[PDB]
Design a protein around this ligand. Structure first.
Ligand code: X10
Ligand code: X10
Ligand code: X10
Ligand code: NA
Ligand code: NA
Ligand code: ZN
Ligand code: ZN
Ligand code: ZN
Ligand code: ZN
Ligand code: ZN
Ligand code: ZN
Lengths: 519, 521, 514
């Protein structure tokens, strides 16, 4: 652990992190629907659809073990309500023991198989029922068909959206915010879904941990404090760790990564965590996250309208996903694998000491690079991280990065893009996207654009002379720093931030963990 | 001379410079064309035109001392080819010694007298024939008429365009790059052209030396490393030299120049080299180059669309031209002159320490200046350099500077602009432009605009309140720092960088050298 | 005369023109300073400098034949005032006859020879006193040195700046006295100055007239009226004739306007043998919206674009001076392809390929580069006349503001002798111009993939030079010059036209052409 430099004594010296969240105190119980539902304290919510009948009526099919509640939920009373996706109603009544109970439903539409986006809308409606209501228990009755992965995603998303991050509130903490202590779930074939519960709780926290790092502003979350947080995480999980400082980075000749950080008051810190299975290692994987804790753009300052310099604390979202994956992997302990979690962390600032547009810098593999724009800093840091990763001798290198704003014009805010030099690895990532329910789309590395990276003076240009397809150009540049290892690159610039809710998504934690686990 | 400060240990501490270039290893021989051409080895190229005939046929006039090549070059076999400017052809054949030779031509058009731009196109086509062909020797046969200056220009341009700067390549060096070892030239009245060969070689390196400094990026070429390179050049040439550091600049009260450099991690360095002739000194000249090794714009940051911040390593092109001229002058050693080569070198950066828009700063002649835009920094450094130059007691002061982007809208990328306070000196610059074949156009210093530099609080404003003709306004500002000396100002902002080829031109080395040489004779 | 189309009945159908101005009623007398200055009525202003002593004191050299005013003008009183250029004071007092007179000075700085810009500043300070005092007479005493041309420029500028254009709103002195050393040599400049003033003011009236008043129909109608008043030959070519002449570049620009294109051709021809023939071509865009390349960028000044016919205006003001002064042995053609560049379903588009009257196909790269298209067909028309010189004058390129600015126009040409004649006309008219090059290396950037030539360059930012290269393609074998007045036409500080070019072109015709 290194000391965080301060300008004034009021500058923070660590990222506040909540490990023991209220979600972790919730006791989860799963019951089979065949035994009927007991309707007692708290709120009991039925998830109901009506296939093929758009905005069709609500009908409750499950057996309910209360005559009063069964009478309330008969078809004649329920048919006045409809299943329109995201719609909900609350019910009040006295049960057979003369206790008042609260019941309701969330509409799940008319399409038998819900997409991750549909299921998220269902969860958001459920969370509105949890907020502003002091409940000790929620019970959820599944009258829809979900596979095991989608059941886990429901739980992960519920936990994540319910959790409210108050680390930076002082005088404006929500004085009414209370969390349930119990969650009941009724589902058909419950025994087959029970193994998903604790996996969902792990995936939730890896994702929420990533969100905590992302949302932490750049005065709290800087290269020293972020690498310190990684050390503490490794200590908690018994992972091996190494933080490389400037002197070691100079010895490794990491000139592209070091140049980006020249202008910052925070020394560069390179994170290397390692998980190794106890048994024979059958696969070795390097996960590389882009870790720019604030991106001002440098001398190519983000001053253009719409460049959103105020959100650029999120430019370490890739590092956060890799560290959240380390939480999940260190918790779940997969066998037969060795995983390296890597991030070349730095901050891109304006200073007398900053690198300049036009500088020619030398990466750790000897390639000279002409810098065309100091705001294309992520690919420079990743170049040196990829050289480092390939020296580890791994089977797969996967990097994840908020690399190019063009991602918003190609895939938008819902799907990440994956690029790579190896179809088998790309297909493994796409399969992990399916089982994590974090959507990714394969995009091409178009070799015809490579000539636009030819530099008159250096071995290569950082940016293209003509091509505006920057996500593809960036991938061509990165490809030059992986010589003979299967490699894939996930550009999460469009999917990292939830603009409607003004908070991170923690995108990539579950994708990467499913990738490690399914291998 | 001074230690280059570093942020990380990987930051470079000197500019790589190649002094012996492959061009210098080319042995050049000039033969009179009257004796006929020998065609034995390598590539032999005829420079051919057809005066008055639009796109007329190739017709070879020279005698060729080989029966086989003469048969190939007969009019009947050449009439399928035309002399269109820049067109070229290659021929393969066996000579009388049964050795395979390569022969060809480059078309020089139908207009007997070629401009500098025309000759450049001819040379560029020649260079394409040298690339991707591993040849030991090139022979050029002039079947066009060129004067001595244009023959020298041909060689200088050939040398400059042929040379490839690989200083910053490591893993991507051209594995196939081979240079000729011999250059043969056949020309009429060869004895009068032989003296141009070594002059062309000197002018080539002065221009290529300037290009090397310009193309070197701002992490390599900073105020300390550039002034160190100037000392090393002065030492090799036996020039007197002095580098003024911050404490001496403070004692000289160089407050405009020092303000520009406040925001940089590199201390300001003022270059002063001197060439002095052995005999009676009849003329004393100060050459002043703008030397901003990187121009971020300062707090008036180059953030507007079209502001090319990524190219601003070229903002010391004027300094580079002056040092390239020092090489040529120190090598050719003219008589009757003393030449001072000056540059107020610094870097324009954004920092807690930078000067601010609105600051009022005091120049070394006591004039107070209101800073209106920190990106108008060149005229500030030049103001103090001009005060220094006039204190030397010279006959002429000439400054050269990448000063105003408006130059691209006035003269464009081919012609530099010259402004000045003295008609005789302006005419001497124009004559040097003609004999150097570096084009310059005289532009006016329009005194009506001077009132727009009136400041409410300081003695003068740095920038105009209303006038958009910024090349003229900048000249008017500079004019305030020359009190009673003949002075001219050459704005090379539009001509310094070759946008098509993505490389410097080294513009001004030959212009300034011709200026010195013509005034010395 | 053609009928001006209207959208509503309130749209104007002619340009109001004032021919008889109050300036024409001023009686001018020039007296030699030797013998002393009489100070009897009105306002008397001394033009005074102080060479070497910058902002030095005012000192009056002339004898004044009034004892009271002489006391006022004593060195001890005048040294409280200084000669900083444009500074002025004037006081009211009783002269020896107990008549109220006003006496004062305008500072002329510390340089002995005033430039045209310095003299404008002097005149502006003089006019400020004329606008703020009810006066029957002004007397100006020259204690500075002016040559004959600068003296005439002084009078022209005084008349022009003093005149106030009130045509769109809903007392002048009657006498001007001038005391100057060697007065007899200056007397012939007075009525020349009055002619040059009105030609310049006439051009100013056409320029300042808004585009609803001054459109292609009403401007060509005004040109006919001028020709009739001056006994010039005249011809207005309409769309049917323009189509028969195949002027496809000019007609394309006007396609989107509600006003039909009108080509003005006036002719002055000397009574004696014609020894020199000259065509003067003025750009006449009565409003330049930019077309589909609309003037929407910050700083594109769409609200000022009524001035895009300033070249035509100068050519017509020149026709006034020439028809009035009647030079011998010359025939002069005054030409303008007048139209309006508008946005409509009917406009030409960026990318259109159009065919000029000499058969050249042109690829339109920007509809706001419309002036060179109209000038292209005008130059083909001019060369068919068989003239010795073609001079065009045009508000062509905004790049002039970045090259020479608002004070000097640029001249380009294909013939050095003709360029030097224009520069000499600039010296004697005191309308400054600077010679700029036509750089042949840029010509390749006008090579079009599909048409014979591009209208604009894709790569070269030296737009004034590229525009000249384009125009040169439409002059085959005639001495030709092109004067770009885009930067000098409008006086931004005073919010009015300059009428730039009228006097320059007249001096060229009178003195330098033949
Ligand atoms: O890609 C570029 C330059 N071209 C470009 C920029 C913006 C839009 C289209 C093209 N610059 C990147 C950078 O600075 N990398 O270091 C960058 C810039 C922006 C975002 C981002 C993230 C978000 F969440 C957004 F909602 C968003 F609009 C943009 C990510 C990376
Ligand atoms: O003139 C200005 C104000 N801006 C401006 C105005 C009008 C037109 C263009 C820019 N700023 C100067 C500066 O910053 N001086 O210190 C400067 C700025 C740019 C270039 C340059 C060089 C080139 F080779 C170019 F191709 C180019 F477009 C611009 C030179 C000097
Ligand atoms: O030159 C162009 C191309 N654009 C452009 C390029 C470089 C710089 C500025 C504009 N467009 C011309 C046009 O539209 N011709 O038809 C045009 C445009 C503007 C003015 C004008 C007149 C004034 F009096 C001004 F004060 C002024 F700022 C501009 C004249 C001609
Ligand atoms: Na953060
Ligand atoms: Na450089
Ligand atoms: Zn970034
Ligand atoms: Zn960036
Ligand atoms: Zn600069
Ligand atoms: Zn600048
Ligand atoms: Zn226009
Ligand atoms: Zn126009």
């Amino acid at each position: 652990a290194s000391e965080v430099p301060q300008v004034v004594s009021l500058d923070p010296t660590s990222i506040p992190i909540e490990y023991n969240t209220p979600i972790h105190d919730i006791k989860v119980q799963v019951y089979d629907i065949k035994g009927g539902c007991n309707v007692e304290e708290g709120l009991t919510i039925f998830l109901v659809n009506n296939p093929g009948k758009e905005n069709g009526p609500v009908k409750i099919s499950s057996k309910v073990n209360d005559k009063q509640v069964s009478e309330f939920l008969k078809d004649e009373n329920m048919e006045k309500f409809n299943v329109k996706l995201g719609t909900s109603k609350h019910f009040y009544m006295f049960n057979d023991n003369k206790n008042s109970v609260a019941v309701g439903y969330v509409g799940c539409g008319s399409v038998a198989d819900l997409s991750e986006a549909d299921m998220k809308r269902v969860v958001l409606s459920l969370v509105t029922m949890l907020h502003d209501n002091k409940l000790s228990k929620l019970t959820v009755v599944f009258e829809i068909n979900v596979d095991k992965n989608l059941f886990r995603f429901f739980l992960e998303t519920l936990f994540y959206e319910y959790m409210t991050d108050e680390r930076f509130k002082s005088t404006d903490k929500n004085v009414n915010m209370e969390y349930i202590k119990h969650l009941g779930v009724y589902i058909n074939n419950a025994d087959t879904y029970k193994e998903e519960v604790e996996k969902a709780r792990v995936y939730y926290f890896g994702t929420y941990y990533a969100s905590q790092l992302i949302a932490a502003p750049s005065n709290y979350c800087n290269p020293v404090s972020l690498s310190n947080a990684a050390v503490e995480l490794a200590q908690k999980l018994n992972l091996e760790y190494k933080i490389l400082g400037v002197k070691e980075l100079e010895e490794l000749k990491m000139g592209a990564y070091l140049s980006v950080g020249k202008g910052s008051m925070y020394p560069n810190k390179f994170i290397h965590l390692t998980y190794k299975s106890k048994g024979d290692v059958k696969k070795k994987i390097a996960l590389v996250g882009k870790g720019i804790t604030f991106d001002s753009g440098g001398y190519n300052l983000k001053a253009a309208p719409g460049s959103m310099i105020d959100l650029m604390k999120f430019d370490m979202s890739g590092c956060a996903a890799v560290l959240g994956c380390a939480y999940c992997v260190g918790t779940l302990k997969p066998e037969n694998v060795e995983i390296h979690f890597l991030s070349a962390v730095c901050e891109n600032m304006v200073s007398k000491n900053s690198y300049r547009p036009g500088d020619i810098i030398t990466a750790s593999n000897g390639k000279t690079i002409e810098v065309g724009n100091t705001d294309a800093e992520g690919r420079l840091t990743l170049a040196d991280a990829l050289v480092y990763a390939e020296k580890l001798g791994v089977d797969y290198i996967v990097d994840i990065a908020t690399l190019t704003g063009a991602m918003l014009y190609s895939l938008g805010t819902s799907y990440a893009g994956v690029f790579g030099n190896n179809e088998e690895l790309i297909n493994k990532i796409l399969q992990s996207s399916k089982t994590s329910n974090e959507p990714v789309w394969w995009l091409p590395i178009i070799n015809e654009y490579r000539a636009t990276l030819n530099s008159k003076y250096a071995d290569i240009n950082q940016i293209s002379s003509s091509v505006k397809a920057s996500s593809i150009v960036a991938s061509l540049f990165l490809k030059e720093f992986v010589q003979n290892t299967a490699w894939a690159h996930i550009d999460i610039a469009g999917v990292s931030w939830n603009f409607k809710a003004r908070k991170p998504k923690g995108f990539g934690v579950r994708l990467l963990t499913e990738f490690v686990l399914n291998d």
